[PDB]
Amino acid sequence: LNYEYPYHPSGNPKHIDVSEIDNLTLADYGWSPDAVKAYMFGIVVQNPDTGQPMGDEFYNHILERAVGKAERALDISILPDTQHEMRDYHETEFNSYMFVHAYRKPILQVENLQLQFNGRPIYKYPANWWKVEHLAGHVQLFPTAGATFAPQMIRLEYVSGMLPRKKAGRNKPWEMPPELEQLVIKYALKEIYQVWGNLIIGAGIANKTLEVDGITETIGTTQSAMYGGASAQILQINEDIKELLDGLRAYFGYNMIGL
Amino acid sequence: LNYEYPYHPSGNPKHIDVSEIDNLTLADYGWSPDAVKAYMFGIVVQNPDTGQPMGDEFYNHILERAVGKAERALDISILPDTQHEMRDYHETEFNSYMFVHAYRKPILQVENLQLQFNGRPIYKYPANWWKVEHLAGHVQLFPTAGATFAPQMIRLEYVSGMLPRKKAGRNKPWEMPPELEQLVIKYALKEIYQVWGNLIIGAGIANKTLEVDGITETIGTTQSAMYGGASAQILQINEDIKELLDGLRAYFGYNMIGL
Amino acid sequence: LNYEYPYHPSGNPKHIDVSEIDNLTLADYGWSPDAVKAYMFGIVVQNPDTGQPMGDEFYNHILERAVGKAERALDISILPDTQHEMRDYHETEFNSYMFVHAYRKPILQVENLQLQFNGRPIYKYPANWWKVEHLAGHVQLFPTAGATFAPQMIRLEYVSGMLPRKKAGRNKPWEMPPELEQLVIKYALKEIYQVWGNLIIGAGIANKTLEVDGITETIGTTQSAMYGGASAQILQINEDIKELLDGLRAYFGYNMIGL
Amino acid sequence: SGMLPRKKAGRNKPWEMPPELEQLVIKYALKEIYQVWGNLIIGAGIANKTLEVDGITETIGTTQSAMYGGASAQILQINEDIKELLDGLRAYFGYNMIGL
């Protein structure tokens, strides 16, 4: 076997280069204003004072915040980032093959793992000992060869995140599931409909009738004293979000810790 | 006695030839577009853009999927197929006259039964020992003369399915009950009504009035902001389905297993 | 007996060639824009400002996400893919004929199975020992001849997925049920109805009346301040989805693990 | 197995069909025939109509509605009759039982 040092092919296979984590963008996951506009096919949002359509700056803003919302509704790291963690010694888990659970998941790869004292490395574990479970967020060692806890004894560096899926309809455990993309889209869309709902009619109008010289024109709009212009669409989007979240909260497990 | 070898007249009587399982078709069970159209007597479904009636390809598609639905709402095999199963040794059931429950039921006939090791037949049981209970899905042997389980010791081949009934108003245990036909029809019909409900009026219209020169024409349709054009028919079909399913889930028993 | 090496005819029969997993497409499973459009026979989705029909790219996008949703509502792998797993040693299950449960199911076939240490094969199990249960997702060995667990001792490679069914109305345990196709169609159709429900009528209009020179028209739409234009169809589709999911969650079993 | 048609009016031997089971089967058929007929009483999907032409005016409200089909009432009454008949017949035939 030959490999780039930390990336032992069995225990810690390389999945991404540290150059690419700066090159990946939201558009590479398909989160783009064009996608949102596709879900709003046949609708246009424009300023009634000017006819100017809504700018892509707002779409990208909403998309980035929707990504943040998805990364907090589920205890996951969506976008690749380098994580550096100082983790505590606990006797039970240290005896359990040096078990540590990462704060962020999935693990793309582990970059460093050391036992240290005041920042001095006390031991550097050979990379061929590292065992990684990517979707779980678990790291262990399987060596080839006065208190129950102590703070910040373990130094761990790794890359968390998800890669864009390689094939249609499929994902590896380190690849973003196709439906989490749609969840993020639904979160963005729920904001865009709240903006659009103000502009279907003049402000605050539920009904109008206008008549001149016996020509009569009359509108009842979807606005009402209770419900906003986009109420129904938002309710449907919330139902879809609920189904998607149930599915994804079955894919990622329940959090647990041993005291 | 004389018989075709596997089909001992008492324990495993022949009910179908293996040539016929390729010749049987949905139409032989009476599932045909004409039957659906008979239940929709006095209605026609046609494309308003062209006046073309709906093609029989769609009816046959819906019928085949409705058959699949019926085969999953009940734990049954409707259409004849050859099943090959590798079944585990369990000590209690093996001592219980070599009891095995087939995964699919009814049994039309058993084709092979052997005890084997790495695909080598260790023993071939004489066909005169085979005892079959067709509707239950049970097979047993009644010989004329370090662990509690082991995987895939038993090799079983059989035909599952149901034959079309020979007489009006009657069925043998290996014949399709007359009302399961109607259940499959009701499942197809529930889709056809959902298609038809879009075409009774122009899209999205609940009311119209049109008046020209004092001639007045006015319609209230069965569409509404809540209920679709075929709501009532679907509700009635669901009631009928519920009664039929209760009856058929009394005919086939509750599933049970001994741990 | 003669066979391609890993694919022992009894324990691990070959069901697909590894060349075909690249060639299979959504269309081979009957998921196509035309299969969606058939369920909306007599409707067209059309931009009211231009008359252009919606492009099939959106249909394909929605279908691919609907497949992802179906693969998360049920704990299954629909489309064929090659899975590589490193699985932990557990003493109880290792003693239980080397029982391992795959993370993904059904198994189409097992490609490799080895016990290893730092990537070195410690033993390679003869293919004639492999016992596979395809729909369950179980693998065992039946040999011909200091801690309770250890990480990643077992190396398992296999193909998960389902093949398109070979006969009408029937599926083998490794073949897709006909009703799961309809489930994926219904998931796509729910989104297409959400899009179309905005376009049946002028945006945000619940009632209109126009009177000009002795011509009068009044229209009430299915849109309302509470309900969107396609509310009814979506509700019925949700009922159908619920029935299908109950059936399929009876076909696949409840998940269980021994702690 | 089976039943013979009864030999006297109003009476059945234990091997003869009860008169009310005939009515039960009739009611089951009739429920389907009413489902068919309930689509045809009126133009399909019409709940209200009004027409005014040259001083002739007609308005009709039908039993069809966005909730209920045209034959809803008859089907409901037939379901009540079926329920009574089934209670009676499930008193005539007993509860099933087996010794394990």
């Binding site: 398909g30 249609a168 | 075409l199 | 394909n60 691919e64 | -």
Partner: peptide
């Protein structure tokens, strides 16, 4: 391969009821 990402109904009088 790659993931896909970006009538007739007539009103008429009942003439028999008109005769009545």
């Amino acid at each position: 391969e790659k993931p896909y990402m970006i009538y007739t109904t007539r009103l008429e009088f009942d003439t028999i009821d008109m005769i009545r």
